[PDB]
Symmetry: D4
Subunit: 222 residues, 8 copies
Amino acid sequence: SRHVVICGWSESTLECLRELRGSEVFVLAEDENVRKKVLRSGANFVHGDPTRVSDLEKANVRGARAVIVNLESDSETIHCILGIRKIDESVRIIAEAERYENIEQLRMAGADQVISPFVISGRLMSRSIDDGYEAMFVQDVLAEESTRRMVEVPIPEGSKLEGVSVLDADIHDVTGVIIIGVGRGDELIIDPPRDYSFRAGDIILGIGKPEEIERLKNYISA
Amino acid sequence: SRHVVICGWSESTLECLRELRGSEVFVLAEDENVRKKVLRSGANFVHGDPTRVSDLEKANVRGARAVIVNLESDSETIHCILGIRKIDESVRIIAEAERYENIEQLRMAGADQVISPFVISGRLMSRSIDDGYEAMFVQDVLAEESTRRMVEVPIPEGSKLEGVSVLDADIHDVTGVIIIGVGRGDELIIDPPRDYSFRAGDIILGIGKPEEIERLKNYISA
Amino acid sequence: SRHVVICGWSESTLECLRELRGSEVFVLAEDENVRKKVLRSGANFVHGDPTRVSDLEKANVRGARAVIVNLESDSETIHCILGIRKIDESVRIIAEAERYENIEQLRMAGADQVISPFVISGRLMSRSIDDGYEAMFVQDVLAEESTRRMVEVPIPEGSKLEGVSVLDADIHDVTGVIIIGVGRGDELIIDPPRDYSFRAGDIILGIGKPEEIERLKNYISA
Amino acid sequence: SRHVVICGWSESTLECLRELRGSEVFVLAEDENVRKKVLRSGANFVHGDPTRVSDLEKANVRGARAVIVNLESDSETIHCILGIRKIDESVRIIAEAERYENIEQLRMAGADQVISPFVISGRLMSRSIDDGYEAMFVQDVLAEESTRRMVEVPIPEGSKLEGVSVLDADIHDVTGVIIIGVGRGDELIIDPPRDYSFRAGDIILGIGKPEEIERLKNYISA
Amino acid sequence: SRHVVICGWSESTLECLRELRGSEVFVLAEDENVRKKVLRSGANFVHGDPTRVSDLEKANVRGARAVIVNLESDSETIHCILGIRKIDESVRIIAEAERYENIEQLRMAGADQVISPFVISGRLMSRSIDDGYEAMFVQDVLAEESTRRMVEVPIPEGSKLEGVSVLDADIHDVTGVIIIGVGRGDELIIDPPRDYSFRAGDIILGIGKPEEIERLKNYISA
Amino acid sequence: SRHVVICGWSESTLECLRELRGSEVFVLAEDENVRKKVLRSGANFVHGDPTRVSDLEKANVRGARAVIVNLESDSETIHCILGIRKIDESVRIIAEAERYENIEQLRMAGADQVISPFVISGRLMSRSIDDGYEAMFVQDVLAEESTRRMVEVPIPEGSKLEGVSVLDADIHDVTGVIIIGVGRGDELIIDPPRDYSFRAGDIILGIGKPEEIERLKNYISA
Amino acid sequence: SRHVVICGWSESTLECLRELRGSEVFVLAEDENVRKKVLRSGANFVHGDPTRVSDLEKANVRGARAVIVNLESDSETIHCILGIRKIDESVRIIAEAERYENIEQLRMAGADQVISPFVISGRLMSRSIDDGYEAMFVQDVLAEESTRRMVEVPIPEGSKLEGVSVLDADIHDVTGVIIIGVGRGDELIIDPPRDYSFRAGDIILGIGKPEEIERLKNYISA
Amino acid sequence: SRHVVICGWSESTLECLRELRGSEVFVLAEDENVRKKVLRSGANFVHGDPTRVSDLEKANVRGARAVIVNLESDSETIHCILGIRKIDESVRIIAEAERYENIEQLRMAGADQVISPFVISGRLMSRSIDDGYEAMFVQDVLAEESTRRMVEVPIPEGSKLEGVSVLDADIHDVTGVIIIGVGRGDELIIDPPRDYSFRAGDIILGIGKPEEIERLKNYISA
């Protein structure tokens, strides 16, 4: 079915729910004081040790749409992932890493996608000591979306750009949206060549103003 | 004004310490156990309460190059920042936010740069449930830097691009680097207008491969 | 629109509850142990995080008669105040400060009235090493009310003192009550000049025996 | 010998020390963690149990100028006082109470002055739900001294007012200071009658501005 | 009525219940984990702070047959007693002291009877280092009653010994029971003179075998 | 064999230390914080686990004069005793019991003398609900020694009572001291038979006033 | 009379529960958190103190089939065993020891079978520094049973091997199973002499593949 | 270089050290409290986080003879192992597992030998509910060695049994030792066939008495 399991619970998992559908969601956590918070956010709760194979099963890891792992240490996170893989070799796994050196480990454990927020943060700290416009960008487009947002956008099964090359698409100058890359199953091509051409299903990874995104959305189908 | 003060301690601030000279660095924290780790990474350690004005003072917040604030809760981060502002009204302050709602408040308290690692981490989760091209872009360029990298590159007091427009300079088509924004004295102009004109001192924010970046360094110099 | 919200729970807020109706009081606190204490004091209890905006919203901060903030540290107190302001710019906020240096900060955050019991206590301690008449005054009119009280008394919509000079009114002679100040429109003129003229809505701040206070209430009326 | 012993440690006693000498003060507390705080404030530390009679002896309670008692509970405070009286029946004891019901008890145990910060606080909170002119006066006279200040001023061995009645002295009109009482050896007479005549070593308790207070001192001189 | 209140809870209060009637008994304690234990032992439980006057009232201290105090520190025990006295000047109070130096304190607080088990123990330890028959006696007559017990026995309103002197009673040699003392309201006379004479109501404090106690019981009435 | 080992620490063992030379004394305990108190009372402190044979060994349990065992639970007391018996089969062991049911077990583990302070304390409570003559006897002679006292008095290698019977010696009627028992080599004969005959070395256990005891010392000597 | 009692809860006792019926198992533990873990393993839960005799009584220790004792320290384990013996002299006790030195002590207390997993583990660790065939044998027949198992197999009331010599029986040749020992009446003869004769009720202790074990069961029968 | 690193500390690793040298052993643990224990056992202590790659480096994992991993959770153990393999891909790693499901996982992470004390334990508990001959054998051969012992014995560079079949060697009848397998470089052949012929450096795994073992060594010599 369409359900999602979340292991552990923190401010990032709380944020993750703002964007998700509560019925859909099962939070698996060791500590009970988390139950009220999880329920208030409109998700289901499961009391269990998320490093225990039988408890991961209990929380419906098997048919799940995706599993999100964020435990209190990299040690527990890895271990959770090892567990999940024993239950389902092919379920999509998203996992938060703490220490840079364990990004690798989570990936050889089974994480399909890793996130290192404490490493991004730690580096934006050092680059920003004198000014750091990089930090401004991250904060104002990834975090707050105060003027511009980054977006994944599908070329529909309609047309307009079907078969058309990026050079002939001239998206930046037609839309106002910068293209960062094109996603086609399992690989993101960043800065795609003039000659690379589009098909229905491809995801465009862009940056633009809300009105610019509306132009882009319009100019891809019909 | 060459020393940097860090308030509190975590993997963020550890990563922070990695890429800047730990000899200019003073870490101020309540917890004794943190001392060992801090000295081990080549910084000095001041034992004190970062919410206490007299403790901020004694840790040389005064004419410091920058103060990095990352405490165990937003409450204490905010308080700490208010404390630093009574000591020095103009010192550069960088600060980590946990909760979205408290970004605004760190800013109002007097933070020059806010970082939101959990807000970012949480968006990337819910965005990554099926695809997560956005997430792999962020992982691979802001965290791991496996192929491409994000750079703030200064236009040197030297020559080539002074006066020349973003349209005329054609930076991407010349150099390979996708240009995301130009930064000038506190502001970042993202996707600048064609007729924008480069001045010396400007910071170019862009994404490229290390040798694409190299070509950009040259192109832009005297 | 007359319910009161109290954030946090201490002997202070217990005492505050003596003089309040109790059914119309809502105490918001993180710690579940507070529930029985609150219910025994005859007030209502909301379990939530008073630093979290949405929890403040749910405790009915908006358009409450007043909010009393007394958290476990000044950091949390300040933070809670910032939260309340976000929900309601105008609601009356009364707040307890621990450290002298945070008195100003609570005000900047938005507190309409700050109270510094430990600063008061500490000054009385140093001043009382040898004799401390000052201490026993405070103790016996602000705390125990053993013989005298301090009161705020409004000049009724009625008359008698309308237009009348403070010299001409002879309030201390007629009434026994030492006038300390007159308050109007949130300015407290302490020890007003002889020529200061009374009007309706003015609040007399005085010290008196309970009989002297009856007396002040008849003198001021009709 | 005029050294001062303080039992326990808190923002209260921190503020106390502000006005005291420091090289003359001995803080007695059970917690080793308090030591750094007490030294950083210019006082001497004694590691002991302030409820233990022999530890109290070790802290030189015997000949002391005064002992200030402020422990973590009324229980402990009461106990510590009982301890002191067993060692010295006539040493000056100043002690902070938390709960109201225990004021009498600190007294019975032997406290010469009791102080109720939380009771004062809770009072001012509930009285401030609308206007708070009272609270305003307290903050700005006992705590902040932003405008006026309280004062004890002895009637010197000397002259001017010896045998002069309060009516004749006319202190408010000469000085601008509001008399609130006369301390007459353990006695505080509040709002003294007009035919009360000042004698040797009476202590006047007043409220006034810095220059009003300076004027009082001259007017009462030799 | 006939109810008894117990403050605090320990192995000695558990033992005390072996001999008491459960309905009769109210245990007042701060900590909930004690509730199941108290209920299992057949007593009633009250959740409350036994140093709080209002909670002592809540637990029915007022009309109680007796109140037994055994808190975790002498500080809390004394304080409890001070509280109880404010509620009922004449209720019988039995209290456990920890430190020898506080035996006095509990008594001037209001305890009608004090028990110092840690002092008795500590001394029997030192006296028993080489042999200590004293310890054997305490342990085998006060604790285990393995062969002999110590007993309080009332001379009934019957007769036999009514008016008779202890010399003429020859109790030791008639009964086998050693007399340690005679209790008559408020005072125990130890080693009563040959001439002292008996009346109905007097309690005999003895030591004997079960059969010896039976002879004594017999030989006092009818 | 002149040193004494104490296992664990409490007010019991503090009282114990009071009346014997702290220079012969080694205290063994898990808790670091206990060190300060122990040195302060003139004993040495060994930091170790009293349930661990190698730790008992290293604390000189071997040929010690006696070992006093008072640990935080009966479980550990019992274990500790078993541990000491593997090291020395015949060293004198004195031990504190908390629970009645565990007296038997400390004994079976190998304790020469058991002490039950809570069992005793608990009996005295329920016995003291109305009268408590028993309790005041125990308080006043085993704890406080306000008038009478309990004494173990040795019959010296000297003279007077050798061979003489308890009937002939008439100790009480001669001396004032109530005689409770005679102790001979591991046993205590309480209320000995008339024809019992005193031998040198016997210990008389009795209750008297200090000068009644003095008369007994003389009467019994050479 | 076939219920089993388990004192304490650990991965050990979880594992033990695999091979037991579960409905007939009662786990006694102090910590309420254990309840959910037990109920998930399909066993019943009693909340009590397994060191307290009356709690053991209430968990039905008396006449249970066996009691398994696995507490958090050897002290508690020993103590619990002593408790059980007091209730039932004959019930089978199986116990887990942590420290080598306590193996003997658990037996003295009354354990019918002791198990030392950490002693076993520690020996295998030191012995395995270089190659450890011994380790992989243990791992693969005592733990994982990946290829072979160890079994106890009874000589049926039937016959075939009745009276037959172990040399004459050729068990290893016929059956594939290495015989290690024969047990009768709680003596285990390991590696019996050639001339040792089998009888009914004897238990063969062997190592074999599951097919070799089927084989042993037919050979031994009929 | 043949120093041994141990990660973590417990009764396991204490027993390990029993048979190891000690001046060659380095224990790596996070807890400062472990230091005293590790020194009192003749080993060296390193204060570090055994899950931190750089701390592992600091402990000289690089060239080590072997590393023993035994942390407080399987999570940590797995993580520590992943750490070691990143530093050294071929160093001998021996690791203790708690839960069964994690045996494979320690292996996948890189453990050369895994040990399951709790799984072994739980097995022997449930199999011992009636007879426990199995458990008896384990205790008295792997732990206590009260009677027999296990052994690995290499077939020396020398002679006697080179190319000799197990049938011809007839080891049980010559020696009295039960052969259980032959180790042949990473291979453990259990119950080897009769026409298996011993070659160079094979390791025989057997059970026997001290003198049976001594006989095996002679019989297999040069």
